Design a binder for this molecule. Structure first.
Ligand SMILES: CC(=O)N[C@@H]1[C@@H](O)[C@H](O[C@@H]2O[C@H](CO)[C@H](O)[C@H](O[C@]3(C(=O)O)C[C@H](O)[C@@H](NC(C)=O)[C@H]([C@H](O)[C@H](O)CO)O3)[C@H]2O)[C@@H](CO)O[C@H]1O
Ligand SMILES: CC(=O)N[C@@H]1[C@@H](O)[C@H](O[C@@H]2O[C@H](CO)[C@H](O)[C@H](O[C@]3(C(=O)O)C[C@H](O)[C@@H](NC(C)=O)[C@H]([C@H](O)[C@H](O)CO)O3)[C@H]2O)[C@@H](CO)O[C@H]1O
Ligand SMILES: CC(=O)N[C@@H]1[C@@H](O)[C@H](O[C@@H]2O[C@H](CO)[C@H](O)[C@H](O[C@]3(C(=O)O)C[C@H](O)[C@@H](NC(C)=O)[C@H]([C@H](O)[C@H](O)CO)O3)[C@H]2O)[C@@H](CO)O[C@H]1O
Ligand SMILES: CC(=O)N[C@@H]1[C@@H](O)[C@H](O[C@@H]2O[C@H](CO)[C@H](O)[C@H](O[C@]3(C(=O)O)C[C@H](O)[C@@H](NC(C)=O)[C@H]([C@H](O)[C@H](O)CO)O3)[C@H]2O)[C@@H](CO)O[C@H]1O
Ligand SMILES: [Ca+2]
Ligand SMILES: [Ca+2]
Ligand SMILES: [Ca+2]
Ligand SMILES: [Ca+2]
Ligand SMILES: [Ca+2]
Lengths: 269, 271, 270, 270, 270
């Protein structure tokens, strides 16, 4: 598609908003531990590593249908162009809680250890599914068959196998420990991520309605919405909650999106 | 709601107000021996039995400042509203934490100083022309909260994530717990809020103080919060960590926040 | 006082420099532990908390007398010295880079000792009058030494904001940091800058350079104006806690350097 | 080579993309622990330090061949490819977000395992020729594997700067990071960017995005010029240490993506 | 001297390059632990603190002779070399990425060893004369080696600012960093830059690149001016502490590279 100029005039700009609930493993709102993974089940060896589906955080994705622009035989066409986004991790202050059941900070007269350890934040806004690259800590891990993982794994999958690719086309199915955004593709998606590891690391997060991320690339062009669909993807692992027994559950939070879009002219292909 | 027009120029078009908000850590009465702290945290015996005391739960601070009356005749084609333009804000008494002799848990053995306030911090301030709009989300949906507080009615496990029906307005001081409510980013068009969180149980608190820094409250259209009914809403929480006692019981510690807001007159189309 | 324009011309600009020695508790240069607090004496209970004056870090303050500007206080306009900018430096930072000082071993008795670490507090201010202070304490039941300046007749309200608990930083080595902090509701004529990191064992972080200048002008382009030709420099630089072999502990402080540039500002005679 | 102006016109710009797999020690794709080092083998003493080749992370390097530019090598001027900018990314970062991999429990046997943490080292470079290296080691008495490229006949001087300990990064997976680093006295024709955080258990920190570009032009507006139409990409990305059940440890590395934009630059015929 | 304008035309610019090897205590290139201090020897007591010379890191300093500018010192104006900018780099950073060196195990005897960590101190300066120093120590009762340059007849005042405790950094490997720091009340003809992070076990953090330049010009557009055509480069780069198996400890340092650009400045003949 040849990309032409921005369409001006009345009714040229639109806004959508949405939220994506976390998919930590307990992904059904009636689950007792909704917004958490099930207790982590650990490998006994290199050869034997069978994590349960409910213990693996996956990416969230939502597809937003935008107003229909083209009533298809005119020489040029219009596509929604995502220009900017306000995005927010909601319920951050829910972590400010030392009375929840858990492992004591000191002895049994103290509060309990709050959610801490590894965090992973990502959001993306694109005009099509986020393109993913496969890479795992162990190629001998047996992943649940009901999830989308790398077929026919080999030790090369512990690094870069150019054959290990996927589309983020299903909510709560693509494990974060298997897939990450592919920087060799994604010409029509903007993604932003941050990771801090460790076992007990204090999580750090901001929240404000004062910040906007601009989605335009170096040519001034934002993601272009193929078939008038807008793809929003996220993961927000905010750490690990430890139970009194010392079993552990990933904790995730929902993410809000507010995207501003405008009409962009393209040449009809 | 209303069609916003241009800024009103001329003499006395600008005003400024200052205020402070005391922390509401749980001991919220100034005669409370531990005013400015929570009571000893009472931990849940089980997920089914989680009954935190009201005095153990930090809540948002809110104050409403009545601004001068702007409109003599409410039938005129245009009217004026106070517009919050910028704010200087400051957490006060930061250096009170620089104290190693306060009763508590020794850093090393009985010859050393005591462990100062540390662990989870939560800082937030907001300036708006109406109550800060809130979204409910909890760590555990089976927690029973004190009934004299404002929390989510008839909680279900969905409330551990985003339930679009769990909405509130921050319309009462020392009543909305931080572990239940956070600013709703899907609303608050007429409020500007700023927040920061660092978790953990022993993390060193980090804070700045100065009178050289101003925050501009104008949105991308150059419009600040517009004060409905001439009321300015200031909200805050400033949990600076946890103090640990000799017995290893623990209290949240908060500090008060100062606001200096500059406002101007904005012309609006009469609805 | 109505503030008018900056006065141009030759000799319109002056510069001063000064240093402030820390006041950690041992505040006499003959004190064996000068630049440290005495061993922290800890409260046995909330009710019984009587810190020794020597264990309580206080603010440093110095008044610099500037060249007299007005030989005739009758003119319709007068001049005031305006603090425009400051280069400031915490001196002796590398003195902390020391693993042999007597103390608590990092590991066992074959290792170096634990260096100064834990809670830090850094503040400097430049003003045309004493720094204005707000009182707030960790515990209202603390009995402070009567020879220090602290809150009179404390009540639990002083654990938060009591609008009546105010003071001026008008004496060196007398106003405890744990009681007093800059009052953001005042200080129209002083610029202050403060940094705090808590914890018991936190690694201290400091920079030192002669390349950095802080501009003191407010949003109207006006710096602090020196009343009666007096410039107020205030500071505290608590760089952490030293631990002794017995596990007793001393606050450690460092001195601060100031180099202030001032210009002549015209004001209407009040 | 006298550098002249940028050649304008259609077809004056090209871009390449490449990925470099990590060289942590297990550097064969059929290695069970490909993308890790083997169990670290520790020195028994100062005198006796024989690390296995498989335990020493090395630099990754790839040479990208660019289109031919000059049909006639006798013309007074010639064209070279000039690297202008690069988008680069550490891939598979989220693979670390894994608490079930076999290893060492965080707490007791009911908990998850400790994820990859400790020392990290990230470096990328883009140049028109091999990255120039300087040799320096923690210990000159270490015996390095003979089929790696290390400093010949070390003496204690090699624990600091020995001006004779120089090399070119001209072999993938052969130059250990613990022996070699970018030489700042050379590398006129390469841009290199490096970041190190030490410690035994430090939480790793990484960002990933497709919104960030690094501009490679020097202070004269000239980027790396590709000699013989070759572009050199070099990298190391050690993301920490994995700890096994027995407490043995493996370095963990991640692959790096490059997307480089290049333009035609006129040079005087040498 | 009165400083006039920059001299333009061909050959008005020059560049020099140099490196400075660390002076951690073992300061002779034939020393087995060159680039480290000897095992820290800790004070028996406050009164008996006698650190060994080889345990005390000192500043590095090099004087570079520049081309002679004035063939006639009779002319009304003279030329001086003016240092305009510097590229500087800590070399060998990746040498610390090494878990096999003999030392203390991270966990038990099957794990790697703890890498260099704890207190770091980084400083570089570029000047037209020796860097001016201020004395300040953790303890005035320390007895320093007499073959080092330290504060004469120390008293407790030297635990803070004594305005008489001054020196010039005029000898390499002689001035202890724990005794001397840059004097911000002087150094009008030197630009210095310093960073400190303390703690016992802190992860060291360092970057390396050839993409960063520091401009040495002051607020008036004048860089350091080289008296007698001599350029002074000073540094210290303590990157942390190595812990041995026995738990004895050695400071670790790295060398620093400088690339300085200078131009010709006109000054009035005195
Ligand atoms: C009955 C019997 O003896 N069976 C053994 C079987 O135990 C053994 O498996 C290895 O046993 C060890 C026990 O200490 C570990 O459980 C190995 O798993 C790990 C480890 O923890 O060491 C898992 C870890 O994730 C792996 N590291 C990485 C980076 O993936 C390591 C790693 O492969 C090894 O440590 C080698 O560096 O292994 C477990 O594989 C098998 C295989 O040796 O032999 C049977 O006979
Ligand atoms: C001889 C005798 O029995 N005397 C007791 C006396 O011990 C007791 O005083 C309290 O004793 C406890 C011992 O566990 C502590 O020493 C109390 O001090 C602290 C504490 O460490 O808990 C100091 C601390 O600074 C306070 N917390 C804050 C936030 O300021 C707390 C706090 O007030 C309480 O823990 C309640 O949350 O106290 C010390 O007061 C007295 C009072 O019970 O009774 C005598 O009989
Ligand atoms: C054989 C004999 O009896 N000799 C003693 C000798 O031990 C004693 O010296 C003091 O001993 C104590 C033992 O706990 C400490 O080692 C003192 O050193 C320190 C300390 O660690 O406490 C060193 C430390 O650097 C100092 N602190 C600061 C901030 O400088 C402290 C400090 O001076 C005191 O703790 C006061 O706060 O001292 C060590 O001096 C001497 C003197 O008591 O008597 C001999 O006879
Ligand atoms: C069989 C026998 O008795 N052989 C000895 C042998 O003990 C000794 O070797 C030294 O043994 C000690 C025992 O604690 C250490 O293992 C020494 O290795 C280290 C150390 O851990 O101390 C390794 C470390 O990397 C080195 N430090 C640095 C900064 O490089 C230190 C260092 O050289 C010393 O601690 C001095 O500061 O050594 C190991 O060398 C030898 C040599 O003395 O003598 C045999 O006869
Ligand atoms: Ca591609
Ligand atoms: Ca909305
Ligand atoms: Ca006021
Ligand atoms: Ca060179
Ligand atoms: Ca001076």
């Amino acid at each position: 598609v040849e990309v032409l100029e921005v369409r001006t005039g009345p009714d040229a700009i639109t806004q959508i908003e949405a939220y994506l609930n976390p998919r930590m493993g307990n992904n059904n709102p009636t689950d007792e531990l909704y917004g958490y993974s099930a207790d982590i089940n650990v490998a006994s060896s290199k050869a034997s590593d069978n994590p349960n589906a409910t213990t693996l955080p996956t990416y969230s994705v939502a597809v937003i249908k935008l107003p229909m622009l083209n009533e298809m035989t005119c020489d040029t066409l219009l596509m929604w162009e995502a220009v900017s986004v306000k995005t927010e991790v909601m319920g951050i202050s829910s972590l400010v809680n030392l009375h929840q059941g858990g492992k004591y900070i000191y002895g049994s007269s103290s509060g309990t250890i709050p959610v801490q350890g590894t965090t992973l934040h990502m959001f993306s806004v694109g005009g099509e599914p986020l393109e993913l690259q496969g890479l795992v800590a162990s190629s001998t891990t047996t992943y649940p068959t009901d999830m989308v993982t790398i077929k026919n794994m080999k030790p090369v999958n512990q690094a870069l196998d150019p054959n290990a690719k996927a589309l983020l086309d299903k909510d709560g199915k693509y494990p974060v420990e298997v897939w990450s955004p592919d920087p060799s593709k994604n010409e029509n998606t903007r993604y932003y991520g941050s990771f801090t590891g460790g076992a007990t690391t204090p999580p750090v997060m901001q929240f404000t309605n004062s910040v906007t991320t601009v989605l335009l690339d170096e040519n001034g062009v934002g993601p272009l919405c193929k078939g008038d669909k807008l793809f929003l993807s996220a993961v927000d692992i905010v750490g690990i909650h430890t139970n009194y027994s010392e079993s552990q559950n990933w904790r995730g939070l929902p993410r809000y999106f507010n995207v501003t879009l405008r009409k962009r002219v393209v040449k009809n292909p």
